[PDB]
Symmetry: C3
Subunit: 428 residues, 3 copies
């Protein structure tokens, strides 16, 4: 149930009804491919083997508005931390020996980590059985080999053009089969296992493959998978657009814009705020975000939608004198900031222009509306089903005296502006 | 005929002679691949069929300075709007039944859209004819199948690692043949058809492939192609760089920079302004932009190049006290902002340093010049043929008193600065 | 020997011990593939030849905080400059005729350039010998052809989906073999040759492939490779985070942040400063940067780490009143800016929370620490071995009176703030 409210007084809109899936952590696992140390259908194998030899060579060669408020993480530090351990002597042999008679196992490593290790491809035992004695005979060994070899080559290609770190994680790095099994064996809730299983492509996109080592006939890379420690909490998206006075004299106008646009998700008694809404992806009513790109705010930040002048949170805005027209396409409609001589319209498919916007900040829902045009820019609106509510209010920019209005404030708020205006009235 | 003028008084340059190709809209079409529901050269087919089976599985699994002034669109809303319709019951059967005896057809869909539908691959009729009865015989059916199957796999790979939305649109999604035919059948001018046909790679880059549905032996994805509703209008690129006073005392200097740099194209009586010049691509003298990343301004914005103090448009600038050196490589030359103790030079290939810049903002054309060096940074200049004109003028930063100069203004203009300076002179 | 110092007085840290590898220039070379003009195992060749024909068709069709202070280069201007020369009549024939009996040669071109030219694939002599007379016989010609043809197709695919410019440079554009030979024949020091040879993937990432021409049975593209004119100079990374007062009253607090974060490398008597630390890549203790994304500063910029109030350089800061919590993961630890009611902790793997941060800016090294948590955000810390030093000092934000503190300054410095504060004290 996606709904939306437009706030006329502050030229912003809030889309709600979303459920969260936030990456809160990482799950690291070691993926191994055992390699072989070597020297008509045979000539096919000859070629297939030469390519094997230089893929191995390649792998060996491989190892010789409010965004500015965010902190800075190190995205593959967990995975790299695991990799640095595989570089201890005999450490890959602990993995090697544990995966002797089994393809997947939980190996207790040295530094005090217990990682699910997984041998996805046993080229070693292939070459050292159905290859070594040669003897043409059957074509089925030729194609089974080309198949296993191809995975190797695709892994090698990805690592080389990406300097050993890839994202999203391909099906060559980790098949649907293996990923599903990995998902099934993680120390997580069932609600989490099913979430991941029904969204593997989103999972792959939030994952890393990290080339670790190729030592003692063994290729090891670490796959770093998202932990969704916050699921099914309410999320909402806040859209904002410039609110300006609409005097006919050019340059006599003042504007303010709510700078706190982005994604918001309830999270452990606070709210996770994602200023760069590209760090989140929406699947139906589920929104996948990453906590690394967020701020943790008091829940009172939401009072800025209902009352931007509330005493519990100092709502954030920027100020300018630059009244350009534009539109923001929301979840269930469109905000239009229309100023000057700009032609601003909304249209239906078969009927054309159905609404002409006058100067100021207005809004239209997506019911019956397919496109929106501001100046020379045509925006298609999203055709998501959901109810829209227009909340009438006096545009707050009307409450300010342009003679003492502080323009060109960026990292500002309702209070900071009040203090300045008052500071300006002190000069009398 | 590419020309260029440098304005000494404002440390900016304008490259003109370009012709426009602006994406103003979208053309949506439905691409279908009919699928089959199933169970030495045959063993080849066996493998080729197993890969078919899990590609289908993968697809099913798949479905379970002035940039801050821009508005915010929803780039694939038109395509997704078409997709939501294919999810109506029997709606893909309207497409299916219409493409019974033909590969391309204009199917009138339910929601009041008429989309060109296109069956690019008929795997269904391949498996259910030259495959089902099996019977080795000829190798030509093996390779014709691997070929058709490969397209499927490549489409599947792109959709999975991109969560069902790809751009640019590959030749696997849509061949040169099919694209050309699609281009040929669109309700557009010939000037537009030829523009697209002579720039398919640019077209592909401005296009989207959107995975829609895999229902009733049919795979459907929507290809979203650019409409160039503005062609062959004059475009010009504005380059800007910091203009500072050059006093020898550190920290006693003031700077201003024109913030209105970017691409400009004449468009329907106004001017389309593209602040993020990476949203535009130049092919020879043709410049491909996207109106979604633009502002619509009065044509008077161009008066800022000839006269930044003009009364018809309030030209935009920022102010600082930070006189670092740098260079901007233009279309036909280079702007050099040289301050402090920085070594700034221009050079020819075989002759080395030919010009040493003194402190301030200067310019050199690309005739005889191959490189430009500011400090430890070497820039190669573009070697495009075209005439360059140096327009002499007193640097306007000399007209300002540093004692009342407002520095650290970002979203500013000539007037805003005047009002502030005057506001500062009021304290006397 | 990577070390790190945290400065408590300014909430910043400096990681040192790094060695430089800066791209200072470009090395351009011409890569050619000679093409053929044409018309069971033969049917294999038939298919392989049809794909050849349309790859050629595709290629022919193909040719018809302080970042805002950076200048603007033109990244492939050197390579494109070389390309414009190959478009002179008979100019590719100079290359063609010179590569008659040899695969690599230094061809003196017209415009006064001498470029190493390299024929990596001779399809012409393949088709016009082991193909033309046909005659099935041996399978080894089939697979040797598919192999050579495949490279062609992969090159063609990359150029088409990238509009003729690719980066990083694939092994299909240029094999490890060819790249190593190219590296070996460049007019560079041995220290440089070995640097490149031990980091080909980094090299490929800093390279461009530029499709030039397909004329007279010859395909030519220009490969643009990095020149590392600065090697083995000391580099250091500066991390910064917001420093705020910690009064319990909301909105009564003031903050400052050092804006000069990024990479620093000693370079020719000055310092190269890279504000966008993503323009640099770290391999062990080697850091690869690009001078195009840098400023050239006096070496005195480093005094801001030991003494931000020094008289030799005006250290840069921004100011605000926005005391949000966050963390910056450094090379050997973590900076924590903890304000308001935010829960801030550091943890060990097997032991959990080991340190709770109080309000203000603090730091913890990576020894014994694996994760850091600020609010709802968990950051893994880097597990690099190296010594960390905590430098105690009074947080400088305590030296300022909030009543005359200038907040919302972005492009500011210690002096600019002093002048403003003093300017504010003038109103008495
Ligand atoms: C990603 S980021 O760059 O860190 C955001 C910075 C945005 N920002 C601005 C507005 N502003 C820019 O956006 N840029 C950068 C650009 F030019 F790219 F827009 C500025 C260059 C100088 N002065 C003000 C600039 C004023 C301001 C004031 C405070 Cl206290 C904090 C942040 C602020
Ligand atoms: C602003 O006005 C309020 C009146 O409500 C007053 O209390 C305050 O002192 C004034 N000045 C500032 C800087 O807030
Ligand atoms: C600035 O100077 C002009 C004089 O041309 C005057 O008209 C104006 O009132 C002054 N002040 C402002 C804020 O523009
Ligand atoms: C600031 O204070 C210093 C005192 O050290 C004084 O010299 C200076 O004139 C004052 N004002 C400015 C704008 O620097």
């Amino acid at each position: 149930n996606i709904t939306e409210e437009f706030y006329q007084s502050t030229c912003s809109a809030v889309s709600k009804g979303y459920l969260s899936a936030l990456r809160t952590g990482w799950y690291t696992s070691v993926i191994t491919i055992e390699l072989s140390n070597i020297k008509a259908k045979v000539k096919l194998i000859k070629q297939e083997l030469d390519k094997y030899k230089n893929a191995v060579t390649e792998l060996q060669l491989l190892m010789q508005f409010l965004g500015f408020l965010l902190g800075v993480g190190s995205a593959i530090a967990s995975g790299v931390a695991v990799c640095k351990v595989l570089h201890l002597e005999g450490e890959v042999n602990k993995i090697k020996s544990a995966l002797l008679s089994t393809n997947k196992a939980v190996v207790s490593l040295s530094n005090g980590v217990s990682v699910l290790t997984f041998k996805v491809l046993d080229l070693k035992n292939y070459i050292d059985k159905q290859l070594l004695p040669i003897s043409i005979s059957n074509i089925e060994t030729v194609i089974e080999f080309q198949q296993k070899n191809n995975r190797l080559l695709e892994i090698t290609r990805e690592f080389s053009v990406n300097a050993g770190v890839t994202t999203p994680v391909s099906t060559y790095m980790l098949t649907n089969s293996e990923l599903l099994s990995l998902i099934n064996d993680m120390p997580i809730t069932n609600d989490q296992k099913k979430l991941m299983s029904n969204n593997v492509q989103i999972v792959r996109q939030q994952s890393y493959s990290i080339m670790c080592i190729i030592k003692e006939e063994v290729l090891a890379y670490v796959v770093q998978l998202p932990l969704y420690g916050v699921i099914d909490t309410p999320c909402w998206k806040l859209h904002t657009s410039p609110l300006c006075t609409t005097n006919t004299k050019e340059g006599s106008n003042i504007c303010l814009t709510r700078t706190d646009r982005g994604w918001y998700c309830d999270n452990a008694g606070s709210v996770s705020f994602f200023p760069q809404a590209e760090t989140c992806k929406v699947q139906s009513n589920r929104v996948f975000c990453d906590t690394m790109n967020s701020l943790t705010l008091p829940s009172e930040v939401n009072l800025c939608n209902v009352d931007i002048f509330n005493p519990k949170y100092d709502c954030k805005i920027m100020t300018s004198k630059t009244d350009v027209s534009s539109s923001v396409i929301t979840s269930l409609g469109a905000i239009v900031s229309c100023y000057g001589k700009t032609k601003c319209t909304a249209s239906n498919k078969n009927r054309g222009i159905i609404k002409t916007f006058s100067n100021g900040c207005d809004y239209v829902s997506n019911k019956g509306v397919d496109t929106v045009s501001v100046g020379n820019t045509l925006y298609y609106v999203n055709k998501q089903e959901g109810k829209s509510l227009y909340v009438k209010g006096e545009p707050i920019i009307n409450f300010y005296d342009p003679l003492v209005f502080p323009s060109d404030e960026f990292d500002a708020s309702i209070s900071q502006v009040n203090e300045k205006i008052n500071q300006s009235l002190a000069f009398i």
